[PDB]
């Protein structure tokens with residue numbers, strides 16, 4: 252039994268990707284873009300009214316296993332697309348003009364593990380040579396300042412960069428998909444938790460992006476929009492300046508592919524519950540996050556390139 256207001260296990264999310272697609276065939280198609288270490292299909296939903304030569308926004312959730320609110324958000328986004336297409340001006344315009352590639356759970360093996368064995372697991376579930384320590388941080392596994400300071404070379408560490416860039420099947424599947432569709436993809440959005448931040452490049456080094464002023468202004472406006480609903484306070488800025496060095500991230504990698512609107516969202520809360528955000532907060536968190544995501548989407552539509 253799936254519910255948008257509860258955390259759903261992988262079997263339930265997987266069944267949902269199939270069912271939401273079949274229920275909405277003129278708005279959603281589903282593909283598998285690869286398989287995980289343990290052989291699970293990595294599903295991707297293409298959300299939008301089909302048309303020729305459409306630009307796209309790519310959004311992933313569940314790079315990190317324990318960040319359950321992220322997984323919940325990708326589901327919420329699809330919920331909103333199907334519920335409000337035809338009923339609300341902006342969502343209607345968005346789905347007509349753009350496609351959204353929504354990857355609801357990247358790190359499926361890790362997600363399963365948080366349901367079965369260890370709620371606080373972060374990494375993938377792949378094995379490592381010379382140790383019994385398991386897993387790689389997919390968000391240190393992309394080929395962008397790969398495995399520099401802010402990632403660990405120790406396979407037993409939570410920020411382990413992996414044996415090589417894109418060593419993880421999951422990372423490679425995502426990067427291959429974006430490389431294959433690069434000319435259409437205009438924005439990259441990665442959903443995480445917690446701490447209430449909107450981050451943009453760079454995180455792999457202390458440097459500001461070419462369009463820093465534009466991204467600063469856009470993040471500032473998105474944070475402002477988010478706050479309108481419940482007064483939730485987000486901070487924002489370049490990743491290395493606002494958060495910490497975190498090389499090998501999907502956002503920096505996408506940016507250096509030429510996707511100039513690239514953001515990481517770290518959702519609620521600020522540490523009271525942390526990763527173990529109560530189900531009672533799913534609705535409010537997803538609804539306010541929708542406002543930021545739609546603001547960014549509208550901006551991208553107005554500044555195509």
Ligand SMILES: CC1(C)[C@@H]2CC[C@@]1(C)[C@@H](NC(=O)[C@H](CC1CCCCC1)NS(=O)(=O)N[C@@H](CCCCN)C(=O)O)C2
Pocket residue numbers: 315318390391409410443444445446450454490494497500501502503515517
């Ligand atoms: C294992 C750690 C000790 C190491 C530093 C703190 C950790 C707990 C962990 N960070 C997290 O879990 C954060 C949430 C914590 C942030 C600090 C305050 C407490 C919460 N979530 S995250 O992994 O999704 N952050 C993304 C940002 C990357 C943006 C550019 N790509 C990422 O790092 O990939 C990394």
Ligand SMILES: [Zn+2]
Pocket residue numbers: 314315318442443444
């Ligand atoms: Zn994360």
Ligand SMILES: [Zn+2]
Pocket residue numbers: 331538
């Ligand atoms: Zn809503």
Ligand SMILES: [Zn+2]
Pocket residue numbers: 554
């Ligand atoms: Zn402008």
